[PDB]
Design a protein around this ligand. Structure first.
Ligand SMILES: CC(C)=CCC/C(C)=C/COP(=O)(O)OP(=O)(O)O
Ligand SMILES: Nc1ccn(C[C@H](CO)OCP(=O)(O)O)c(=O)n1
Ligand SMILES: Nc1ccn(C[C@H](CO)OCP(=O)(O)O)c(=O)n1
Ligand SMILES: Nc1ccn(C[C@H](CO)OCP(=O)(O)O)c(=O)n1
Ligand code: NA
Ligand code: NA
Ligand code: NA
Ligand code: NA
Ligand code: NA
Ligand code: NA
Ligand SMILES: [Zn+2]
Ligand SMILES: [Zn+2]
Ligand SMILES: [Zn+2]
Lengths: 157, 157, 157
């Protein structure tokens, strides 16, 4: 039994940097409006992992309106979701994340993102891929209004 | 042999509600312009299933311009595509769907979506995940101009 | 060991046609601004293949700012990436690509795209799916400002 999962998240720019993406603190000239980290890459990833296990998603698992969690960085949410996710018998296959942003430049940060993720999920660095791409100045992402990430996850049970 | 598939669909808001998403009748203040249901979640899913079997997509399989089908709800299209899809030897792995909409709220409807889908594909409820996410007021989806869904499917042959 | 991968690319319309998509020369009234082919479908696909192998992405592998490659069509980049990708022990599972464009019409070109891809990756035509979809006149893609593609890839090691 192998299980595929998809996640997608978005945040708007606002206030002052830096931002956190994939756990890394990246300097930039806005920060991200969010009730949390606003770490889009770990949000999308967490959702791909939950979706592959059919556990729903962050929003279900962790209500903005709910307890225990409202004081939360996205790396604890990820580690919590994974903790549930193994409790149903699952194990990691691989994981591939696509950050979609006009800036800032993600590339140099991209190794450190992967050690955070690989550590949080207990796997090897090489079950984790991350890339970033622009939308060439089209779209809300191209106008620098915010930042999207998609992710995919393969779980083995 | 395992086979991965991706689908993506979009519809514009217009006219009066409710909408159908994932087979469920959801009350809302616009409805969806479409030559059909305008059920974005079953359209994207159907495409992820067809793509994983390399059968193309709805638009190929069922021309807006073509017969037998023009009088069609998206749940029959899904069941037809699946019917083809098993005829080439395939069997269901799992399926994860991401509705992207500012409103309405999908969450409460999300169990019933899954019994429709699981039934239509003949699997267990737990080979089916559905989530919805906002784009935080950016984008055509954030401006409430319409509604996008992505889906992924794993088939076993 | 099976490995899943995701890619996403975008290009803006500008200048005179035709465009190249999936290797095919498609007549149209704008062409695509790009430092290269501007073939969005092979870019997204190449990234899904690289991501599944955890090799990063085109942009890493082939700097716009870097050598050996600046004189490059997207079909050589694809064949190069695949060439790396097998060097780490990987083999093709399947591949499903979703072109997102208001025009031109991709459908008639879609067989020939698949023989290019299948050939470039050395597989059968039927490990390759391609579809195109519109965003119903919403979005930068619906306003005909440019052209997006997503892709997913399954690799066997
Ligand atoms: C999976 C994804 C990210 C698909 C395409 C994204 C898309 C068309 C986003 C909205 O663009 P937009 O916000 O430019 O529309 P608007 O023109 O209103 O800014
Ligand atoms: N926000 C972003 C978007 C893309 N990238 C990677 C990409 C280089 O890999 O930037 C170079 P590009 O301008 O050629 O896309 C990046 O590192 N950060
Ligand atoms: N249209 C949508 C969009 C998102 N959701 C789920 C999400 C709660 O899970 O809504 C809460 P959010 O406002 O915190 O995103 C939803 O249920 N319906
Ligand atoms: N640019 C595009 C977008 C979609 N398609 C396929 C689709 C028919 O399959 O066009 C018909 P549609 O207008 O019903 O979507 C296409 O062939 N080219
Ligand atoms: Na979110
Ligand atoms: Na949040
Ligand atoms: Na459609
Ligand atoms: Na339709
Ligand atoms: Na690009
Ligand atoms: Na390019
Ligand atoms: Zn988020
Ligand atoms: Zn549709
Ligand atoms: Zn490109």
């Amino acid at each position: 039994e192998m299980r595929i999962g998809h996640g997608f998240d978005v945040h708007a720019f606002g206030g002052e940097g830096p931002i956190i993406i994939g756990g890394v603190r990246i300097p930039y000239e806005k920060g991200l409006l969010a009730h949390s980290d606003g770490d889009v890459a770990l949000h999308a990833l967490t959702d791909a992992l939950l979706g592959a296990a059919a556990l729903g998603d962050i929003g279900k698992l962790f209500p903005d309106t709910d307890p225990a969690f409202k004081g939360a960085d996205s790396r604890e949410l990820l580690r919590e979701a994974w903790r549930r996710i193994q409790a149903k018998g699952y194990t990691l296959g691989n994981v591939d994340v696509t950050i979609i942003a006009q800036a800032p430049k993600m590339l140099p940060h991209i190794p450190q993102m992967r050690v955070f993720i690989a550590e949080d999920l207990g796997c090897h660095m090489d079950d984790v891929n991350v890339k970033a791409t622009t939308t060439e100045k089209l779209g809300f992402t191209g106008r620098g209004e915010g930042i999207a990430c998609e992710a995919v996850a393969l779980l083995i049970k």
